[PDB]
Amino acid sequence: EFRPLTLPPKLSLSDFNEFIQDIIRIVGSENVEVISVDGSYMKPTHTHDPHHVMDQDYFLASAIVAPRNVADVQSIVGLANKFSFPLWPISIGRNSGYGGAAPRVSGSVVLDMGKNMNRVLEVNVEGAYCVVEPGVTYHDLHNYLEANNLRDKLWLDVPDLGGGSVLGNAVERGVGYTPYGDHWMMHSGMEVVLANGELLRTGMGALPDPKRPETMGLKPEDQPWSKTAHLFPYGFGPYIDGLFSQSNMGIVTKIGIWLMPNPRGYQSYLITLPKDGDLKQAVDIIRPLRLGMALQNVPTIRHILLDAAVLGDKRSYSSRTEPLSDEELDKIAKQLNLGRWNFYGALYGPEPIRRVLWETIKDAFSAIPGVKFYFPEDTPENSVLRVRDKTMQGIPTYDELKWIDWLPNGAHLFFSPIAKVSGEDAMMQYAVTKKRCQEAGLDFIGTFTVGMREMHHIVCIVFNKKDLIQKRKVQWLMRTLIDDCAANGWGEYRTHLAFMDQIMETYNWNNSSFLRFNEVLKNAVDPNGIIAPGKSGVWPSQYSHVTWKL
Amino acid sequence: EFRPLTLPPKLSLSDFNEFIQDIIRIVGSENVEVISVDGSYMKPTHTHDPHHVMDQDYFLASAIVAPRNVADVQSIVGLANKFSFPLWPISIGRNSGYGGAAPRVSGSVVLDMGKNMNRVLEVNVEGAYCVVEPGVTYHDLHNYLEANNLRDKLWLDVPDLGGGSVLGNAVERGVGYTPYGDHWMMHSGMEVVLANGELLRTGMGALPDPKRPETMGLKPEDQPWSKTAHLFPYGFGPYIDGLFSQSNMGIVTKIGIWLMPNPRGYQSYLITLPKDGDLKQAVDIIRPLRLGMALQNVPTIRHILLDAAVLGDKRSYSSRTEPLSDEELDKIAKQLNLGRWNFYGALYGPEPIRRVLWETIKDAFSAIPGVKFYFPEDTPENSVLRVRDKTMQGIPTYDELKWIDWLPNGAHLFFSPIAKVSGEDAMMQYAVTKKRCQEAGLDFIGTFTVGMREMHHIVCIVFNKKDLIQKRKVQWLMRTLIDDCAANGWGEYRTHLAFMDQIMETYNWNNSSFLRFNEVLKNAVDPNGIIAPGKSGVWPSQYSHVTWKL
Ligand SMILES: *Cc1cc2c(cc1C)nc1c(=O)[nH]c(=O)nc-1n2C[C@H](O)[C@H](O)[C@H](O)COP(=O)(O)OP(=O)(O)OC[C@H]1O[C@@H](n2cnc3c(N)ncnc32)[C@H](O)[C@@H]1O
Ligand SMILES: *Cc1cc2c(cc1C)nc1c(=O)[nH]c(=O)nc-1n2C[C@H](O)[C@H](O)[C@H](O)COP(=O)(O)OP(=O)(O)OC[C@H]1O[C@@H](n2cnc3c(N)ncnc32)[C@H](O)[C@@H]1O
């Protein structure tokens, strides 16, 4: 194909066409598309940000490429080093609220790694791990487990929806809700194609499986792994794995992910907190429970509007066009039999141990006036408890997609600061966050997810993507919040394409020492800067900061 | 001082003298010793390898310099850049079995970080963590906690001995014996001086503490951390932390380490396993109880000679010169009331819970005939269990020094391959290692430490450091085990200075892509190659592989 809307920087139409004809010859026409449509979550777009906060076409591919296998990735890396051509690797491209598939730089090729590199490569019972290509969704892996009857042996750890990529998510350092919620920390042994195009496996992936007749003459990409590659992450030497999470340092083609053995018993629960202000005492309670390990998983603390938005759009609760007031949340709370904040967790292992922990947690929270406790069977058919009862046991679902439609053309954008597990800091962050959403004319929606010594506060900004005036207020809210939170001692853990530079500028301890360091590494491994220029605000030297930063 | 024993490569005598005059000016001559004696554990040497497998003077410092503070480190670095002068940074230098404080390159300035940089900087209760400098030993910190009554709120995690640096050991990715035994995984918020001299803090350490009047004009080194620094490791962007463990990528000045809250219940224990072959079913039994958190910590499986050696030297058990027979090891077993393998664990938390766990473990191991369960109270006063009682609850001891003296001028050398948590794998690693130990005329001594999905297998080579015939046999032993283990798909997790090259050459999947990618990052951040050249087999470009490898 001949003519795209946007060319990559410094690249001619004639060069671009040579590149494309070249790539077609490798991967076939059926695996290439040049852009000369926001799609669905069920069928994600690969061309741009479906939940756009800037103009729809602001972050736009010049084309999409789908390698057939790892060899293609290498060949494609080669040509991009030849032509000086920016690549943007996605696994699945369901990173909505962070930009979806869209490339940080327009004119890039989007590498749809997921379409053909699909395979669940291994599920090892005794080692309680699995090995995975970019294309394996949470649901995909769920179904492989069923086919081979492994459901009674091994559980998954799923984020709030079923379609993201196990690896996609893991390298974004994302989060789920079993004791295996720290997704990044569950990996051992990743294979990566570098900016030079050479293959590398990490940790004990670097210790090769010894030779035997069955595996002779296998291309490296197809060689098995030695027996410890997915068991012991460190390997030997400097431990580089993390240089591949949230980086543009390489293109991940495989990853091993630890899986929880069937725990021996499971019980989910809801605790409902009546007052807006109860968040303070509730978090002080969480602290030692989590830290002392009566809280086995990553339990979340949901604001009322999050459950309500699952349950029906805003028109369903009021024809109001302004944020719902403090007192309507009370009415909605009491309609839905929920509190102002709603705490979800679960209990794992034998009855005798579940009993003890539950009595501890039950006891601890009873200090909060008006508290009420529910198992799944005590709630209506449509409840968030029922849905989450699935989630905290590794079953992929999709019911939580509905909150996206809180407003007539609902898109989400995530503001994701980190809080202490302390009522006081939490209230402050809430206050700082709630205040601004207001000035923006938006309902406040958000969770806190509970890590051991921190909470991921996911403020869920939902907007009508066809509304230009609102879009701008969303750009104002985000940028303002980033600042407010930095001035209060809080950083964000993950974000959107349009906020990456701003966010990094925030991690400026000692004259931006962190980003400088990262650039030195980026330019050495990426001398042509072809991988994902601009991810996390890291720019190769051929990318002027003045031209390229937002 | 004027004339040193060995000079760093490519550097004149005239230059060394101008250099050390510049350092003497900064650190004062009290913090400089030019070398022109082995010591012990309590007074550890800073010049060479106290447990030398090569000639005593093979790895040898040219001087030892003791920075008073972070600013002295920046100047020394600046000067080491001026003169191309290798630095070898240590914290305490108790890396016995791995080369102690010896530099990999003879001629280097051993950088004694711990002499003056000494402070327990922070102990935060609600976050349950500490911030520490290199000079703080495990005993140092223990006494800090006792002296503030903190031992009732927070416990430590300690290796077998208490002399090691909390930070130094963690950057070596070392292991301890509570649920906090994965020392490295417990870090958060590292401060690092780079090869160019510049300070950097990782993770949310890069998110600045907001401005206030109390902290104005503080040197970057002396600034506080933002509230989340030591709560959330990741921060934002590429997670570069691990580039600083087992690496030569920088000089660490400060680290945050997570501390486990008093669990509200503790009980250690021993299980004795009569036969040599009982290892196989033991491991097979441990596997599901590890994955399922009936075993909450890092338990150990000790060879009978490990315990035997703590209680008495070889000369006391047999007069024989060769290795001990099988029957002579059942004799020592029945003598000491231990099995051939001895499993040391510990239960944590409230009694209602400790109880259930224990009944599962007891009942799990009962399928092994002649098994015996002991609490500390059930054993002789000198027993290893009584020592590990303290160990598996964060109390330092020094009792385990006694096994080093299993031979006249006993020295240890660790061979530390990683095994699967499977009897088959473990027996195999045992057989492989026992065979070669015979050939070399050594007794086999070691422990397995049970990580979640891996075991660290510490083959404890003790040898007579004044016997040149045996030191050569130990060299042969080491180099053969490395090769054999490799040929059976196992790699070492850490090693001695003389085996760094070989071991790293072992992880050569896809023609040493791992090393090549490591080399690339090193030359980027260390142009003149001054920080610890040769650490983990990673050499900067101006060190010829031909000249430097062993
Ligand atoms: C809409 C929304 C999103 C959401 C959520 C709830 C709603 C309603 N709940 C989440 C949750 O609880 N936890 C969480 O971590 N995220 C949640 N999200 C966000 C999103 O839906 C998921 O996180 C989703 O899994 C992420 O998208 P996906 O997994 O498909 O990843 P991707 O689109 O391919 O992009 C990942 C980014 O990471 C880097 N990347 C990905 N693959 C590679 C490879 N192959 N090599 C190198 N880098 C890779 C890229 O930077 C890419 O941009
Ligand atoms: C003799 C022995 C040793 C031993 C053991 C039992 C016996 C009887 N059991 C151990 C165990 O249970 N777990 C464990 O991790 N180690 C065990 N050992 C080995 C050793 O004694 C300890 O590991 C000890 O704590 C290590 O030594 P130390 O703590 O003093 O650390 P160091 O010598 O200063 O440094 C070791 C290496 O780390 C790098 N390093 C240290 N500081 C820095 C700084 N700040 N910057 C950059 N790198 C640093 C260096 O590479 C140094 O060589």
Side-chain angles (χ1 to χ4, degrees), chain A residues 2-263 265-550, chain B residues 2-263 265-550:
Chain A
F2 328 84
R3 301 137 275 182
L5 302 148
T6 315
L7 298 151
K10 284 157 181 119
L11 194 86
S12 84
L13 201 46
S14 183
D15 273 357
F16 176 87
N17 266 276
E18 220 205 296
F19 180 90
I20 260 69
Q21 274 305 319
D22 275 353
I23 288 220
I24 286 169
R25 271 175 227 110
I26 303 151
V27 302
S29 67
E30 270 6 275
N31 287 310
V32 175
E33 177 188 9
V34 166
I35 318 312
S36 339
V37 162
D38 298 333
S40 27
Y41 172 98
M42 300 158 228
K43 296 249 163 168
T45 185
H46 293 134
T47 73
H48 72 280
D49 170 17
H51 287 202
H52 28 98
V53 314
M54 317 306 284
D55 298 322
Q56 201 197 355
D57 77 344
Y58 192 76
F59 308 106
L60 185 69
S62 72
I64 305 93
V65 184
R68 282 146 343 140
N69 48 218
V70 171
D72 290 2
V73 186
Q74 297 199 289
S75 287
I76 306 154
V77 164
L79 305 155
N81 277 297
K82 216 200 199 247
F83 295 88
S84 249
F85 207 139
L87 305 182
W88 187 264
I90 65 177
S91 290
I92 279 302
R94 279 170 178 141
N95 219 22
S96 342
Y98 295 137
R104 179 56 173 94
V105 164
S106 284
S108 278
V109 167
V110 159
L111 225 39
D112 180 349
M113 296 281 313
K115 184 184 154 211
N116 304 308
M117 314 170 56
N118 243 191
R119 304 161 300 140
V120 165
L121 296 151
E122 215 200 337
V123 168
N124 186 259
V125 172
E126 64 158 44
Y129 70 73
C130 69
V131 173
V132 117
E133 284 185 317
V136 179
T137 56
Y138 284 104
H139 215 117
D140 284 348
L141 180 56
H142 177 251
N143 299 308
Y144 177 102
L145 284 203
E146 306 278 78
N148 313 71
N149 292 315
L150 303 172
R151 177 211 194 124
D152 305 300
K153 275 156 209 147
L154 297 173
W155 287 8
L156 293 198
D157 178 296
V158 297
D160 277 326
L161 314 145
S165 166
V166 187
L167 143 27
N169 202 283
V171 308
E172 268 295 87
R173 288 195 297 266
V175 161
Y177 309 110
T178 69
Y180 275 43
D182 203 302
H183 284 182
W184 174 251
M185 272 334 234
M186 296 297 103
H187 89 87
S188 224
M190 0 167 16
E191 162 171 294
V192 162
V193 168
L194 307 181
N196 57 27
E198 292 160 30
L199 267 158
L200 181 156
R201 341 240 244 195
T202 64
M204 287 278 190
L207 196 289
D209 200 38
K211 306 195 124 132
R212 53 158 194 286
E214 298 74 47
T215 60
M216 303 298 305
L218 283 176
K219 323 209 210 195
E221 0 143 358
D222 307 318
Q223 284 170 15
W225 308 61
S226 76
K227 37 179 146 111
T228 274
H230 313 98
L231 298 182
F232 181 52
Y234 302 147
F236 169 77
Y239 177 43
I240 64 166
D241 301 50
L243 241 188
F244 297 102
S245 48
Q246 306 203 16
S247 71
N248 50 17
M249 300 289 272
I251 299 169
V252 190
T253 74
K254 303 176 161 61
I255 201 163
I257 296 292
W258 296 343
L259 310 181
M260 209 188 194
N262 187 304
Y266 170 73
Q267 182 60 71
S268 62
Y269 58 89
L270 167 52
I271 302 182
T272 65
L273 318 148
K275 316 212 180 247
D276 191 17
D278 286 314
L279 165 71
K280 150 114 177 47
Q281 176 177 20
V283 173
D284 285 330
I285 280 157
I286 302 209
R287 210 206 115 260
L289 296 178
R290 195 75 174 81
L291 226 22
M293 291 193 295
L295 282 176
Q296 274 159 296
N297 57 342
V298 183
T300 55
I301 318 168
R302 290 157 72 101
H303 181 274
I304 175 74
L305 279 204
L306 196 49
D307 291 2
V310 168
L311 270 222
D313 74 0
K314 178 161 178 175
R315 271 150 71 102
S316 124
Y317 300 94
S318 163
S319 230
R320 210 164 143 165
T321 250
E322 290 286 284
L324 298 172
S325 79
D326 215 285
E327 291 97 19
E328 298 153 281
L329 313 179
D330 289 333
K331 297 191 265 232
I332 292 177
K334 69 143 214 220
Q335 282 172 38
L336 295 172
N337 264 318
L338 294 173
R340 273 309 284 273
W341 291 95
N342 306 82
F343 178 80
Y344 293 85
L347 302 141
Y348 305 80
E351 202 282 339
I353 286 232
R354 288 196 265 122
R355 201 221 191 127
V356 187
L357 298 184
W358 175 239
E359 279 161 15
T360 286
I361 311 171
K362 211 197 184 128
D363 202 45
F365 270 90
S366 337
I368 303 167
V371 91
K372 277 175 193 153
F373 311 90
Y374 302 92
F375 291 173
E377 283 308 323
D378 313 317
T379 64
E381 240 230 74
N382 60 342
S383 86
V384 194
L385 188 50
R386 261 165 220 270
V387 198
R388 294 192 83 68
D389 171 65
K390 279 143 240 232
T391 304
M392 284 167 300
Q393 76 180 293
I395 299 158
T397 72
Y398 306 93
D399 312 83
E400 302 223 37
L401 251 189
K402 240 326 131 131
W403 70 250
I404 284 183
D405 291 314
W406 183 246
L407 304 175
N409 313 267
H412 67 18
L413 168 73
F414 295 121
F415 179 68
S416 314
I418 297 284
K420 306 199 278 180
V421 196
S422 107
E424 172 174 48
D425 203 58
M427 287 300 268
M428 208 145 92
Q429 204 174 61
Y430 186 41
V432 173
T433 293
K434 174 165 102 157
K435 171 178 191 130
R436 293 297 192 190
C437 279
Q438 193 87 53
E439 294 156 21
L442 289 184
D443 299 294
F444 170 101
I445 313 187
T447 339
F448 293 100
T449 75
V450 200
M452 187 65 93
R453 291 175 161 70
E454 52 86 8
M455 295 193 318
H456 278 48
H457 185 9
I458 312 299
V459 173
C460 297
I461 297 166
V462 357
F463 65 93
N464 177 352
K465 49 157 141 143
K466 300 221 164 145
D467 192 331
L468 278 141
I469 283 144
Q470 192 169 69
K471 288 183 106 172
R472 267 173 256 134
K473 285 151 156 158
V474 183
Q475 274 172 237
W476 177 79
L477 169 70
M478 190 81 177
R479 290 208 183 282
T480 311
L481 276 168
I482 296 159
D483 281 4
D484 269 322
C485 298
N488 278 258
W490 295 315
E492 292 70 67
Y493 105 101
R494 152 140 87 142
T495 35
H496 191 273
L497 299 165
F499 304 103
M500 274 166 179
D501 298 305
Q502 213 194 320
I503 274 119
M504 180 66 108
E505 186 35 32
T506 240
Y507 291 85
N508 63 345
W509 185 75
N510 186 224
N511 308 325
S512 286
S513 186
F514 188 76
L515 186 53
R516 291 297 85 88
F517 180 72
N518 275 315
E519 306 178 320
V520 164
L521 312 185
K522 171 60 167 178
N523 290 303
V525 308
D526 205 349
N528 298 309
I530 35 137
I531 304 318
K535 185 32 175 173
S536 309
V538 187
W539 296 97
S541 41
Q542 48 284 280
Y543 285 80
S544 173
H545 289 322
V546 177
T547 298
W548 286 102
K549 289 219 224 173
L550 312 158
Chain B
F2 330 88
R3 339 124 221 241
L5 273 182
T6 301
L7 298 110
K10 282 174 213 113
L11 200 63
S12 72
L13 202 105
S14 193
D15 282 323
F16 181 100
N17 258 270
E18 190 176 301
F19 186 91
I20 255 93
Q21 270 344 291
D22 287 336
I23 303 219
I24 273 158
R25 233 168 242 113
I26 291 157
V27 308
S29 69
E30 296 304 82
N31 290 308
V32 192
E33 211 209 293
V34 180
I35 319 307
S36 357
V37 159
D38 266 344
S40 67
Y41 185 82
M42 278 79 194
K43 218 18 83 164
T45 187
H46 291 147
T47 69
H48 75 292
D49 193 12
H51 291 219
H52 38 83
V53 310
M54 311 300 288
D55 292 319
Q56 168 182 36
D57 68 293
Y58 201 65
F59 304 104
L60 182 87
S62 71
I64 287 111
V65 183
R68 295 162 307 132
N69 59 201
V70 180
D72 293 4
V73 189
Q74 298 184 300
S75 291
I76 288 144
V77 165
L79 295 153
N81 274 317
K82 194 124 142 359
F83 293 90
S84 317
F85 202 139
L87 308 155
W88 190 264
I90 58 145
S91 299
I92 290 304
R94 273 172 182 138
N95 221 25
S96 272
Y98 294 131
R104 170 62 177 82
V105 173
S106 293
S108 309
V109 163
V110 162
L111 212 64
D112 182 351
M113 287 306 287
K115 161 145 173 227
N116 308 307
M117 279 147 104
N118 228 175
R119 283 153 314 143
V120 169
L121 299 172
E122 229 224 292
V123 165
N124 180 283
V125 180
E126 39 153 41
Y129 70 78
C130 60
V131 184
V132 105
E133 287 193 308
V136 181
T137 57
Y138 289 106
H139 212 146
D140 280 326
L141 184 57
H142 180 253
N143 286 323
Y144 183 101
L145 293 186
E146 281 281 314
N148 281 122
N149 305 310
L150 288 167
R151 155 247 180 130
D152 271 8
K153 278 120 158 260
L154 299 181
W155 287 7
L156 291 187
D157 186 297
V158 276
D160 285 334
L161 331 153
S165 166
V166 180
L167 127 41
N169 175 285
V171 302
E172 277 282 278
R173 292 196 304 259
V175 170
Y177 310 102
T178 78
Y180 281 41
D182 188 337
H183 285 169
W184 174 252
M185 266 5 202
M186 299 287 121
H187 92 89
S188 165
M190 269 185 88
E191 191 177 84
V192 169
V193 175
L194 300 162
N196 64 15
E198 304 164 19
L199 274 161
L200 176 145
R201 338 239 244 206
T202 73
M204 293 269 164
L207 197 289
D209 189 43
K211 309 228 155 228
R212 71 174 182 269
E214 291 71 43
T215 55
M216 305 300 312
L218 277 183
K219 288 220 228 154
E221 352 150 13
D222 284 320
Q223 281 168 28
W225 297 67
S226 59
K227 68 188 83 152
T228 259
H230 312 103
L231 298 164
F232 179 64
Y234 297 144
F236 180 82
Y239 188 39
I240 54 138
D241 283 59
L243 253 197
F244 300 117
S245 65
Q246 292 206 25
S247 77
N248 54 26
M249 301 303 261
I251 304 143
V252 189
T253 48
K254 278 176 199 39
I255 199 161
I257 304 289
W258 297 336
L259 293 189
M260 165 188 245
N262 191 296
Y266 178 71
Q267 188 57 84
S268 46
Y269 65 84
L270 157 74
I271 306 168
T272 55
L273 320 146
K275 303 253 167 266
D276 196 19
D278 282 328
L279 181 66
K280 140 92 176 161
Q281 241 179 310
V283 186
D284 280 342
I285 284 164
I286 302 154
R287 198 201 125 269
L289 335 149
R290 198 63 176 86
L291 258 343
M293 278 120 9
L295 302 161
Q296 318 161 258
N297 64 331
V298 198
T300 32
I301 301 159
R302 287 161 78 91
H303 200 254
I304 179 64
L305 275 188
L306 198 52
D307 291 342
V310 175
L311 293 200
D313 74 334
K314 190 202 190 139
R315 278 150 55 93
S316 90
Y317 289 109
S318 198
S319 227
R320 270 154 75 123
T321 251
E322 282 296 82
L324 307 184
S325 39
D326 243 63
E327 314 75 76
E328 265 180 311
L329 288 179
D330 310 304
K331 250 178 249 130
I332 293 167
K334 134 236 114 188
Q335 243 165 67
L336 301 182
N337 261 307
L338 304 166
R340 276 297 288 266
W341 293 100
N342 297 87
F343 178 66
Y344 295 75
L347 307 142
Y348 305 83
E351 199 269 354
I353 270 164
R354 262 189 282 128
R355 219 162 121 224
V356 180
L357 290 200
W358 184 237
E359 262 167 51
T360 266
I361 298 148
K362 265 193 94 181
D363 168 64
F365 272 87
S366 271
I368 295 180
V371 82
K372 294 230 211 64
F373 306 94
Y374 309 91
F375 290 172
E377 275 288 80
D378 298 336
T379 51
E381 210 268 326
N382 64 342
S383 80
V384 193
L385 181 50
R386 247 165 228 269
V387 167
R388 300 193 70 77
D389 187 52
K390 304 189 190 53
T391 294
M392 283 177 283
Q393 89 178 270
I395 304 164
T397 65
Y398 294 90
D399 309 74
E400 308 225 26
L401 271 155
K402 250 267 91 200
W403 68 253
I404 283 124
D405 290 309
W406 169 263
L407 285 190
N409 307 279
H412 63 11
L413 174 70
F414 299 111
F415 176 74
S416 339
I418 286 277
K420 266 160 55 135
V421 194
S422 110
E424 168 145 47
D425 200 62
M427 282 302 266
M428 179 152 85
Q429 215 175 92
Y430 185 42
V432 168
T433 319
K434 205 175 96 211
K435 186 141 244 197
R436 296 294 194 187
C437 270
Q438 260 344 276
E439 287 175 27
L442 273 239
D443 292 283
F444 170 94
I445 320 156
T447 6
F448 295 96
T449 81
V450 186
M452 173 86 83
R453 269 158 179 92
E454 51 94 357
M455 293 188 296
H456 287 50
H457 188 356
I458 322 307
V459 173
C460 313
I461 299 149
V462 18
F463 63 92
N464 172 37
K465 72 170 118 165
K466 289 218 177 93
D467 184 3
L468 321 123
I469 295 185
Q470 192 180 50
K471 293 167 98 201
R472 278 179 244 127
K473 277 236 207 76
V474 167
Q475 265 170 252
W476 177 85
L477 175 63
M478 195 69 174
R479 299 215 175 275
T480 308
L481 279 164
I482 288 165
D483 281 357
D484 274 356
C485 284
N488 289 274
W490 301 305
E492 290 61 82
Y493 101 101
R494 147 138 95 144
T495 30
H496 191 284
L497 302 165
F499 310 96
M500 283 187 183
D501 294 306
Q502 202 184 334
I503 263 128
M504 179 61 102
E505 174 53 35
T506 251
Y507 295 77
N508 65 342
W509 185 82
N510 200 219
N511 324 286
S512 293
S513 190
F514 188 78
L515 186 60
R516 296 289 93 80
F517 172 76
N518 271 300
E519 279 161 11
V520 154
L521 300 168
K522 165 98 207 173
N523 294 312
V525 294
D526 203 353
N528 310 305
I530 42 126
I531 318 294
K535 181 47 172 143
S536 316
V538 186
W539 294 93
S541 86
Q542 63 282 270
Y543 284 71
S544 168
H545 287 331
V546 160
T547 315
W548 288 105
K549 268 184 226 220
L550 297 135

